[PDB]
Amino acid sequence: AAQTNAPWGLARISSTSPGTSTYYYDESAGQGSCVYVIDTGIEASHPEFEGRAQMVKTYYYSSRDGNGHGTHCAGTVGSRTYGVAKKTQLFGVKVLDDNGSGQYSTIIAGMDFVASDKNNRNCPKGVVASLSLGGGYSSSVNSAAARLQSSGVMVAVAAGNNNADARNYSPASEPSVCTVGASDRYDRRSSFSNYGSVLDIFGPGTSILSTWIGGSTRSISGTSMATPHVAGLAAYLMTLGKTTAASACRYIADTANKGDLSNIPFGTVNLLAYNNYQA
C-alpha cells in the first residue's frame, strides 16, 4: 500500500533515505493487534480513528482527553491519515491529567492495569503499549514497565526531552522495555532528545503532524512523538507475523536504518525505526 503526501515521519519509517513523502506499508496495517496509549487519554470520536479507538481506563474524574497530547500520540500509532498501523485497535488509559501531569503512583497503576486488561481485549496478533511520559529515575516506575513487558506487552517508552542521558529518567532507563529517542526530517537527532546506552531505537519526533482534540490536527515535537511511531511499527510487524511482544524491540533494532543519524553521542545507538517494507 502507498499513502502519498504522508506526514514525513511515516514516509521516513518506510524509507532507506530521508527526504521522501510517501508512506509504504503492508495493507494488513496492524489489523488484529492492539495498542494501549497510556497518556492524557484519546478523543475516540475523532473521525481519524474510525471507531477503532476506545477509552478503557481513567484515574481522574473524566476519561476525556482535555489536553490533546494523548490524542496526538494515538493518532501517530493508528489514525487513518497520521498513523503507522492504520487498522490497529487503540485503547486509551488516562494516567495523565489535562495538564499532562501524573503522580508516579497513578502511572504505575495504569501500567499494571494494561498488563491485566489485555486479557479482556481481543488482540490475536499481539499487544503493544505506548508510554509517552516520564520523570526522574524511579525503581518502582521501571519495575512497573518491566512487569508490563514481562506480561506479554511490547512496551515502548519515550527517552525524554532533556538533551540528557536517559539513564536518569523513568521508565526510559528500564532495560527490558523499548526506549525511543527522537530524530528530525533531516536525520539529525532532535535537539531535545535524550540519549545514552539505555536507548534502543530512534523514531521521528520533530514537527510531527497528527490528530488533536476538538477533531483537529497539529504538528508538535517530542520523544513523545517518536514513541508512537515505534509502538505502531511494532503492532504492524506483529500482525505481519515478523515478531512478537517479547522480541519486537530487538527486531526493530535489528532491521533499523543504521549509522544514518547525525549528532548521535558516542555510545548511543545510531538506529532509526524502519519497516523494511518492499512494496
The active-site residue out of 15, 33, 39, 46 is 39
> What is the number of other CB atoms lying within 10 angstroms of the CB of residue 193?
32
One residue of 79, 179, 183, 275 binding Ca ion per CB under 5 A: 179
DSSP three-state, residue 259: coil
How far apart CA 159 and CA 200 sit, in angstroms, is: 9
What does R_g of the chain's alpha carbons equal in angstroms? 16
Among this protein's residues, is 63 annotated catalytic? no
Nearest approach, Cβ of residue 98 and Ca ion (Å): 29
Rank residues 71 and 149 by Cβ distance to Ca ion and give the closer one. 149
| 81 binding Ca ion? (CB under 5 A) | no
Interface positions, 192-251, toward Ca ion (CB under 5 A)? 200
Among this protein's residues, is 69 annotated catalytic? yes
Which residue of this chain has its Cβ atom nearest to Ca ion in the complex? 179
| 31 binding Ca ion? (CB under 5 A) | no
Q: Is 97 annotated as a binding residue?
A: no
Among this protein's residues, is 39 annotated catalytic? yes
CA angle 272, 179, 11 (to 5 degrees): 30
Q: Is 95 annotated as a binding residue?
A: no
Residue pointed to by grid coordinates 481485549: 121
DSSP three-state, residue 30: coil
DSSP three-state, residue 220: strand
How far apart CA 32 and CA 2 sit, in angstroms, is: 20
Which residues are at the interface with Ca ion (CB under 5 A)? 179, 200
Query: Which residues are documented as binding site?
Result: 16, 175, 177, 200, 260
Query: Which residues are documented as binding site for Ca(2+)?
Result: 16, 175, 177, 200, 260
Catalytic residues: 39, 69, 224
